[PDB]
Short mmCIF file of C-alpha atoms in Angstrom, two decimals:
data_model
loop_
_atom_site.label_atom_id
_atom_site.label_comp_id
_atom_site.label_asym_id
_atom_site.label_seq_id
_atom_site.Cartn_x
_atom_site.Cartn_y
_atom_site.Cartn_z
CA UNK A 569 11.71 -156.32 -19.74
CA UNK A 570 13.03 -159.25 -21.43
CA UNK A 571 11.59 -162.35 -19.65
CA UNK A 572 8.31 -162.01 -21.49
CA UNK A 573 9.75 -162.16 -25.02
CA UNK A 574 11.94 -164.72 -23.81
CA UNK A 575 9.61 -167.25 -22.86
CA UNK A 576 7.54 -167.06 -26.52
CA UNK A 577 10.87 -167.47 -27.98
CA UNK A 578 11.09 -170.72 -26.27
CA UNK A 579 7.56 -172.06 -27.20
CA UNK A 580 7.90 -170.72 -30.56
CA UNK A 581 10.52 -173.22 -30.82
CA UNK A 582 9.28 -175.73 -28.83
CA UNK A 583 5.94 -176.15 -31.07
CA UNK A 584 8.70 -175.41 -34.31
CA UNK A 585 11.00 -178.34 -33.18
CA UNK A 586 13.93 -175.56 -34.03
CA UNK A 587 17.17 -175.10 -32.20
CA UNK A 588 17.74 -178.39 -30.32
CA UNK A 589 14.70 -176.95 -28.32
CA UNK A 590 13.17 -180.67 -27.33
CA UNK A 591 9.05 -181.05 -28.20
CA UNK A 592 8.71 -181.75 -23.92
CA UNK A 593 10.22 -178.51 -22.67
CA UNK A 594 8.20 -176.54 -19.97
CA UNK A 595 9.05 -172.89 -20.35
CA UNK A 596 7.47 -171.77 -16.94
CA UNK A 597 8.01 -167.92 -16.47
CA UNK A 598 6.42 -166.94 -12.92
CA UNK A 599 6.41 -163.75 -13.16
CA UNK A 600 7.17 -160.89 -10.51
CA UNK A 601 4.18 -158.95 -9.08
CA UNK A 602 5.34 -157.48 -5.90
CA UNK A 603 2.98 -159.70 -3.96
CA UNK A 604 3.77 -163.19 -1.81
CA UNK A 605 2.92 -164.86 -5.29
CA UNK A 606 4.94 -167.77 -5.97
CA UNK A 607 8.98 -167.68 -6.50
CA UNK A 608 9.69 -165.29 -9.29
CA UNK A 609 11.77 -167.03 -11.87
CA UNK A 610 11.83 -168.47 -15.83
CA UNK A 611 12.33 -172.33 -14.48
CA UNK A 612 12.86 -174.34 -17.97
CA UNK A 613 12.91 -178.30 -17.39
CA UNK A 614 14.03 -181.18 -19.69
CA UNK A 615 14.08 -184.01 -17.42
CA UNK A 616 12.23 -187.14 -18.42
CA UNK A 617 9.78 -188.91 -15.78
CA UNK A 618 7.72 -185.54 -15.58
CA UNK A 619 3.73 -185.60 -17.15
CA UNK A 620 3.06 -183.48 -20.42
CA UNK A 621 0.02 -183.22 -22.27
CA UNK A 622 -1.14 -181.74 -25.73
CA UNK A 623 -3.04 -178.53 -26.63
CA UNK A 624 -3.33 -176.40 -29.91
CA UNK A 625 -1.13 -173.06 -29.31
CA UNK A 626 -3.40 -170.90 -31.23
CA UNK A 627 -0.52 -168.33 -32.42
CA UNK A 628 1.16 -170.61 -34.62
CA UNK A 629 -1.36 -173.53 -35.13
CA UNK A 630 0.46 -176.47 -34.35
CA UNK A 631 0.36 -178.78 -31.17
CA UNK B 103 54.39 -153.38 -20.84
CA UNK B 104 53.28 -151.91 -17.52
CA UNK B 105 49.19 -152.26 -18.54
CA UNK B 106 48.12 -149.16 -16.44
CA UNK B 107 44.33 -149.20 -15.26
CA UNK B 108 41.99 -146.81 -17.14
CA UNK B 109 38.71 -144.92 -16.14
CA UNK B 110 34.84 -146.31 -15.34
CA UNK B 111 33.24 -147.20 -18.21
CA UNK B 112 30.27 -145.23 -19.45
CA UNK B 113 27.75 -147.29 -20.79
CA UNK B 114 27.37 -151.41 -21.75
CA UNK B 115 25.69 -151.73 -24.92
CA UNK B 116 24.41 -155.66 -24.95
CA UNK B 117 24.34 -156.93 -28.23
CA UNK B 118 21.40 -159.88 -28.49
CA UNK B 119 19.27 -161.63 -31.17
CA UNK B 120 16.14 -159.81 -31.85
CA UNK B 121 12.54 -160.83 -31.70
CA UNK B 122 11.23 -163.91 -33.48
CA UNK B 123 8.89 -161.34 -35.45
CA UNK B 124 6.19 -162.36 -38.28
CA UNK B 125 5.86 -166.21 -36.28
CA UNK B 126 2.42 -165.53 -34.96
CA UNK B 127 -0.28 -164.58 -37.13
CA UNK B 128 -2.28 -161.43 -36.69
CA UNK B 129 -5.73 -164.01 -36.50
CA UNK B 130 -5.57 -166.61 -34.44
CA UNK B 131 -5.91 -170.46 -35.39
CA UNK B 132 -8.67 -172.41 -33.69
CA UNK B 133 -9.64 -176.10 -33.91
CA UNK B 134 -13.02 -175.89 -35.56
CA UNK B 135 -16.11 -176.68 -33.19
CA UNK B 136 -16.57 -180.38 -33.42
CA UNK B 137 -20.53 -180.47 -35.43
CA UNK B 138 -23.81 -181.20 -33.80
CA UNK B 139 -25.25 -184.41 -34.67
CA UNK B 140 -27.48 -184.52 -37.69
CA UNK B 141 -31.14 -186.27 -37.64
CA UNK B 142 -29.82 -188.60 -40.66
CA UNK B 143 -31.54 -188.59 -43.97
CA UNK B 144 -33.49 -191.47 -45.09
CA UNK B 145 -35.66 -192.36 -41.85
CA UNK B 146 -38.78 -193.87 -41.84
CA UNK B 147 -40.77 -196.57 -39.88
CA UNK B 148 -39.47 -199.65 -40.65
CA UNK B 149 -41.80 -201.53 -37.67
CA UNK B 150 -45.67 -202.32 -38.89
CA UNK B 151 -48.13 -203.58 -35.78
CA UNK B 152 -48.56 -207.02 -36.45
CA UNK B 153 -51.89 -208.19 -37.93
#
């Protein structure tokens, strides 16, 4: 019940440059359904060499 | 200074930072839709048929 409002709280600083947070962080939050989905988890990586791309997040209005 | 053991504790209050409230607006923030092109003003037939 936490996992959720953890993950905004990492894009909200992500797309804020706040906290030491870098710009190229994927917050990745695969979520648990109770089904063979994919490996429940909240996988955050900061490694270069990955690929990244920009959108607009529409909640806050910045890239 | 014997530090006896004491009983099972009751309850674990977890003491955390609270919700990044008032961040996200209540509308949301689109890129506006890129225009249609426009027929521009000041056309006209520049080409006569010779002779």
């Amino acid at each position: 019940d936490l996992a959720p409002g953890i993950a905004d709280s990492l894009r909200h600083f992500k797309v804020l440059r706040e906290k030491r947070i870098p710009p190229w962080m994927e917050v990745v939050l695969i979520p648990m359904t109770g089904k063979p989905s994919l490996y429940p988890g909240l996988f955050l990586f900061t490694t270069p060499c990955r690929l990244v791309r920009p959108v607009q997040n529409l909640a806050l209005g910045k890239e | 200074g014997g530090l006896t053991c004491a009983s099972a504790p009751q309850g674990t209050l977890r003491i955390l930072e609270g919700p990044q409230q008032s961040l996200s607006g209540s509308p949301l923030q689109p890129i506006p839709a890129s225009p249609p092109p426009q027929i521009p003003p000041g056309l006209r037939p520049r080409f006569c048929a010779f002779g």
